[PDB]
Amino acid sequence: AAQTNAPWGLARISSTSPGTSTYYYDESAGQGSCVYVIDTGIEASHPEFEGRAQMVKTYYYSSRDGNGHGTHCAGTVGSRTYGVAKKTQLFGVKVLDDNGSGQYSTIIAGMDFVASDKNNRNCPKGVVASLSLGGGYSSSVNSAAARLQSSGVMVAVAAGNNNADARNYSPASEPSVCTVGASDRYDRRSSFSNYGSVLDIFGPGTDILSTWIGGSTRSISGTSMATPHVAGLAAYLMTLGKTTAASACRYIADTANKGDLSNIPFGTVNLLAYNNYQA
């Protein structure tokens, strides 16, 4: 299948060179997989989700996304026009308030919730969790992310937007999950992207067009935007049978475009997520 005039990040993950405009992908499109987006919520009524999105848990007064961040991330995972895995099932868990903030105790509860809730869902091709959030180092937050990964869920987390070593941020610094940095459309490390040896993979993160609340769209930037590219790619590869939740991060690294990024500090991997599609 091919989507012409795609957002640049989708085109980039299906190409060996920057500057293309077509997203090439297998028609299976993540069908039969499930992605939990743990964030500010999802506007599930957005036409771009086609009935495939559902809020399953909130830690606040409402399940509505009153911010937009979670709806944007979910759109990069699996919306029709802006998504990597266009037939996946999306589940929203609202651990961040409508200002985009949340306490660590609530974020931990949301991770433990997903590890249990997935056993009540029909996800024959596997389960992914996308965490576009983080803060200062916490061994309790790292431990919760490791539990979620151990329970059989492919966990992808943002490296953070401090132009610093991700070792000092959580859950970015948990080794057992997939830690995602951000790149721009000219194959540079995004100027805000964290770096360091704990990074596993880079994805498109600068000027990412996706869904927004009120049935709208907008472009924003962050490692928050790179993470759902990798989460959607994992769901897509699990549906194709190429990998499992336990090994998807390693498989994505193994099959990545290597050495193509600039402004990568010594000791950080030079790997850009790639779907290896062949017509």
Token pair belonging to 253: 């690294």
Q: Where are the domains of the chain?
A: 2-272
We find that the CATH architecture of domain 2-272 is: 3-Layer(aba) Sandwich (3.40)
Do residues 113 and 95 touch, judged by C-beta distance below 8 A?
Answer: no
What resolution in Å is listed for this PDB structure?
A: 1.6
> Is residue 127 marked as binding?
no
How open is the CA angle 38-51-77, to the nearest 5 degrees? 40
Which element (helix H / strand E) includes 224? Answer: helix 223-239
> Is residue 230 marked as binding?
no
Please list, residue by residue across 34-64, b when 16 or more beta carbons sit within 10 angstroms of its beta carbon and e when fewer do. bbbbbbbbbbbebebbeebbebbbbbbeebb
Alpha carbon distance 48, 46 (integer Å): 5
Alpha carbon distance 93, 59 (integer Å): 8
Which residues are identified as catalytic?
Answer: 39, 69, 224
Nearest CA-CA partner of 94 in 76, 106, 78: 106
Beta bridge partners of 181: 202
> Is residue 117 marked as binding?
no
> Is residue 171 marked as binding?
no
**Distance of CA 19 to CAs 8, 11, 108, 220, Å?**
8, 8, 39, 19
**Distance of CA 37 to CAs 89, 111, 159, Å?**
11, 10, 16
> Is residue 16 marked as binding?
yes
Sign of CA dihedral 237, 239, 243, 248: positive
Token pair belonging to 8: 């640049």
**DSSP line for 2-46:** EETT--HHHHHHT-SSTT---EE--TTTTTTEEEEEEES---TT-
